[PDB]
Design a protein around this ligand. Structure first.
Ligand SMILES: [Ca+2]
Length: 223
């Protein structure tokens, strides 16, 4: 997260870190045994870390659980990142508490202008790379489709939504991928891609979660 602030300890209880020897993506706990992330974060073996604040220091609230089933959306297109969503079934249910909690699936698609919270351990610089130890937070609004593409060097599909600032300075970045965009307590987006990080005229692009609620529930029921 570029231009954000350090989240209060365990204030984003649904936030998880996908680890394969190192943190490489984020995700959201949607129930005691399922995590939703981005399909581009797929790896054959993943350890999901919950209850984290400082990813490099053991604090006493962590739960590390291996992924049992890693399911990418069948129509994920790696070229365009269309349908960039993935579900992870944990090897065992986690212990839900104050520091490890679930986030609700959306009941409807949030309107442009809605204020949301984006979080992650991704890159904090608009140039170069710096991985933070502590979970970063960013309050940003959902932008209208038209305003996003106005002066950007990219276009998006109907399964994508732009969240951020057209003036730049604040944005998600590499390493935040798969992470949550929560608006009014519901998961409305998943960190997916963008041109650079925090650049003027180029807001971040996120998977529009409200378009997949049915797929999510069916998959969870069938596995
Ligand atoms: Ca820790």
């Amino acid at each position: 997260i570029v231009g954000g602030y350090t989240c209060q300890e365990n204030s984003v209880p649904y936030q998880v870190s996908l680890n394969s020897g190192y943190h490489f993506c984020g995700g959201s706990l949607i129930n005691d045994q399922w995590v939703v992330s981005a399909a581009h974060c797929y790896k054959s073996r993943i350890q999901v870390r919950l209850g984290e604040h400082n990813i490099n220091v053991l604090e006493g609230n962590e739960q590390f659980v291996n992924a049992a089933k890693i399911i990418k959306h069948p129509n994920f297109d790696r070229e365009t990142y269309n349908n960039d969503i993935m579900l992870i079934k944990l090897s065992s249910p986690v212990k839900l508490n104050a520091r490890v909690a679930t986030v609700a699936l959306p009941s409807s698609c949030a309107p442009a202008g809605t204020q949301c919270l984006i979080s992650g351990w991704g890159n904090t610089l608009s140039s170069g790379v710096n991985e933070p130890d502590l979970l970063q937070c960013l309050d940003a609004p959902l932008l209208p489709q038209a305003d996003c593409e106005a002066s950007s060097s990219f276009i998006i599909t109907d399964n994508m939504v732009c969240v951020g600032f057209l003036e730049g300075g604040k944005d998600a970045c590499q390493g935040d991928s798969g992470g949550p965009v929560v608006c009014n307590g519901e998961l409305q987006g998943i960190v997916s891609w963008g041109y650079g990080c925090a650049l003027p005229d180029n807001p971040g692009v996120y998977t529009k979660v409200c378009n997949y609620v049915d797929w999510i529930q069916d998959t969870i029921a069938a596995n």
